[PDB]
Structures are given as C-alpha cells and as structure tokens.
Amino acid sequence: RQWALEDFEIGRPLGKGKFGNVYLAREKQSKFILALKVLFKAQLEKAGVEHQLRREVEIQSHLRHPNILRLYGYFHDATRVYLILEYAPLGTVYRELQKLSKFDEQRTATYITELANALSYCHSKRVIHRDIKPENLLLGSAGELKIADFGWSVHCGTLDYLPPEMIEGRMHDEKVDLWSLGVLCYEFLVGKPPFEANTYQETYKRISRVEFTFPDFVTEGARDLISRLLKHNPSQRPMLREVLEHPWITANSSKPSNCQ
Ligand SMILES: OCCNc1ncnc2oc(-c3ccccc3)c(-c3ccccc3)c12
Structure with missing residues (x-):
C-alpha cells in the first residue's frame, strides 16, 4: 500500500x-x-x-x-x-465545549459511556492511553465520540489532564485512563477541568493534592462518579465496567455499555 x-x-x-x-x-x-x-x-x-x-x-x-x-x-x-x-x-469535543460552554448530563454520560467502551477495548488489547483531552476527541457524522490521538502505549505541555502518578514521577498503568474519565466527566459538566490554574506550578499542586470542588449545579450522581474516579491512588480507581454500570451513567446515557 x-x-x-x-x-x-x-x-x-x-x-x-x-x-x-x-x-x-x-x-x-x-x-x-x-x-x-x-x-x-x-x-x-x-x-x-x-x-x-x-x-x-x-x-x-x-x-x-x-x-x-x-x-x-x-x-x-x-x-x-x-x-x-x-x-x-x-x-472536536473541544470546539463543541467552547460553543456550548458546558454539556448536560445526558450528553456527558453518553460520551463517558463511549470513551469507557473504547478504553475497555483498548485495555483488552494491553493498550493504555496517555492523557485524553477534548482537543483529541473528534465527532463522527452521527456525533459519536472518536479518540483521535495516538497517545497510547503497551509499555509537557499542559498538565490539566495528567494524573498525579504521571506528574509525581511514579509508576503508571491502565488506571491512568480512569483518571482521564474523571477529569473529562467534570470538564463536560462544568466547562473547565477540575485542576485548572493560571500556572503550571499551580496546576501541578492542585493535581498532586487532588484539590478540586464542585459548582452547585453538579448533581450527586455526577459528583459520586467523579469523586470515585479522581483518586490519588490508582488502585482505588474503579474499573471501566463499574463506570459503565454506574447508576448515574445508566440513568443518563443514550448508549449502552459494551464491555462485553
Ligand atoms: O489526528 C487527528 C487529526 N485531525 C482530524 N482528523 C480527522 N478528522 C478531522 O476532522 C477535523 C475537523 C472536522 C470538522 C471541523 C474541523 C476540524 C479534524 C481536526 C484537525 C485539526 C484540529 C481540529 C480537528 C480532524
């Protein structure tokens, strides 16, 4: 070819x-x-x-x-x-976010479902994605989310989407991706990533401490899912199936949770 x-x-x-x-x-x-x-x-x-x-x-x-x-x-x-x-x-999901300012829980839930499926599938191939950003999330003709960057690995830059283990210079695995979902889930709902700051060094500290808070308009189910995903300790991060079978997700998503 x-x-x-x-x-x-x-x-x-x-x-x-x-x-x-x-x-x-x-x-x-x-x-x-x-x-x-x-x-x-x-x-x-x-x-x-x-x-x-x-x-x-x-x-x-x-x-x-x-x-x-x-x-x-x-x-x-x-x-x-x-x-x-x-x-x-x-x-990109990035442009959509700029235009819409923030997403409703059903668009968010649907995107998290589609991301989670994509990642379940990658995990099943011993493939782990580096950080996932809205700029690297593209939309097909029916508006299906597509992971577009090749930031994978079998084994910066802005820090906003990186997990503490990856900034703190530690060992990272598939759980990195779970962090990603938590950052994106927050960002979709609020309109900016939870650790956003006016400086690298700021953002570094917020992430390493897992220091964020919710706006009043974020609901309890969203909050519960995001708190469970934004875990300093990777092993406390849920598995992708538990994300797919989260009540907030099953209640709000338009797509089903292909694991399979
Ligand atoms: O590796 C991904 C390369 N980028 C793309 N690849 C494959 N399809 C695409 O459609 C786009 C795109 C689609 C409609 C409106 C505007 C852009 C883009 C696009 C490229 C660069 C930056 C932003 C978005 C794009």
Missing part, C-alpha cells in the same frame, strides 16, 4: 497540530473522503519524537473500534510524513 501525495486532492485545512497541519482530502481513484495529517520530518527529528510517532502509529493501526479514530495508512517524501486518517466531520 504505497501511497503518494499525487494520489489525493487536498481540500480545506481542518486544523493545526504542533507538528503539522491536517487537511480534508480525497483519494482520486476511489473518491474516498478522508483526512491527511502532514508532519514535517525536521520537527519530528528536532523534538526527537519521530520514534514516539512510529510506536504510536503501529499501535493505532491495530485498533478497530467505532469510538477510535481509524488510521488507514501512511507514506512520506523527503521533507514530510503523512498520516491518512478517518475523517470526522463534526469536529
């Missing part, structure tokens, strides 16, 4: 990445609409992540889930690398 740039018509820019642009594109022979991520080789070398990318792309290609952004292939020229991605027409 040796693709080349001449195989595609390039359309509008879908957005910027630090390492490269993403463009709507269409494969000429088939007319298949997709996304093309363009990464500059110099930068990948310079930042010494080029091998990070490689690892992640290899993990990514092995993932088949409706809640995980599909990677169709890759190719490169002298100057750049290119990832051929599934096109997610409805944008």
Whole structure:
C-alpha cells in the first residue's frame, strides 16, 4: 500500500497540530473522503519524537473500534510524513465545549459511556492511553465520540489532564485512563477541568493534592462518579465496567455499555 501525495486532492485545512497541519482530502481513484495529517520530518527529528510517532502509529493501526479514530495508512517524501486518517466531520469535543460552554448530563454520560467502551477495548488489547483531552476527541457524522490521538502505549505541555502518578514521577498503568474519565466527566459538566490554574506550578499542586470542588449545579450522581474516579491512588480507581454500570451513567446515557 504505497501511497503518494499525487494520489489525493487536498481540500480545506481542518486544523493545526504542533507538528503539522491536517487537511480534508480525497483519494482520486476511489473518491474516498478522508483526512491527511502532514508532519514535517525536521520537527519530528528536532523534538526527537519521530520514534514516539512510529510506536504510536503501529499501535493505532491495530485498533478497530467505532469510538477510535481509524488510521488507514501512511507514506512520506523527503521533507514530510503523512498520516491518512478517518475523517470526522463534526469536529472536536473541544470546539463543541467552547460553543456550548458546558454539556448536560445526558450528553456527558453518553460520551463517558463511549470513551469507557473504547478504553475497555483498548485495555483488552494491553493498550493504555496517555492523557485524553477534548482537543483529541473528534465527532463522527452521527456525533459519536472518536479518540483521535495516538497517545497510547503497551509499555509537557499542559498538565490539566495528567494524573498525579504521571506528574509525581511514579509508576503508571491502565488506571491512568480512569483518571482521564474523571477529569473529562467534570470538564463536560462544568466547562473547565477540575485542576485548572493560571500556572503550571499551580496546576501541578492542585493535581498532586487532588484539590478540586464542585459548582452547585453538579448533581450527586455526577459528583459520586467523579469523586470515585479522581483518586490519588490508582488502585482505588474503579474499573471501566463499574463506570459503565454506574447508576448515574445508566440513568443518563443514550448508549449502552459494551464491555462485553
Ligand atoms: O489526528 C487527528 C487529526 N485531525 C482530524 N482528523 C480527522 N478528522 C478531522 O476532522 C477535523 C475537523 C472536522 C470538522 C471541523 C474541523 C476540524 C479534524 C481536526 C484537525 C485539526 C484540529 C481540529 C480537528 C480532524
């Protein structure tokens, strides 16, 4: 499957990445609409992540889930690398949050269900995601959440989404992902992450202490689920099935909890 740039018509820019642009594109022979991520080789070398990318792309290609952004292939020229991605027409959960300001409990519950399913599935493949941010959550045509970044591992930057074990320089595992769900569940409902601060060093301290509080409009069931997930000790974090079978979740979600 040796693709080349001449195989595609390039359309509008879908957005910027630090390492490269993403463009709507269409494969000429088939007319298949997709996304093309363009990464500059110099930068990948310079930042010494080029091998990070490689690892992640290899993990990514092995993932088949409706809640995980599909990677169709890759190719490169002298100057750049290119990832051929599934096109997610409805944008990022990040933009949706900016426009809506905050989500209702049924949209939140549905997104947490879909994230949890995606992660159950990854955990079942001995795959663990690094931090998960709204910027890296894309939406398909029916508005289904898709995890779009390849930040996985079998074994910064803003700190807002990182767990204490990962900032405190400790040992991290699948429970990292459980923390992620808690940060996102709070953020969806409130409109900002629970440990947000005006400085790295601030945010560091809030996370390490697990120092946050709820606005009055957050309900008891949401509160209960978030407090159970935002646990300094990873082993006290619930398992993904317990998230899927949480009364707040089953009561509010539109999707069922595929474990299976
Ligand atoms: O690895 C993910 C690359 N990015 C994408 N990949 C695959 N599909 C996509 O659709 C988007 C997108 C969709 C509609 C509106 C705007 C953007 C984007 C997009 C790219 C960069 C930053 C923000 C969002 C995108």
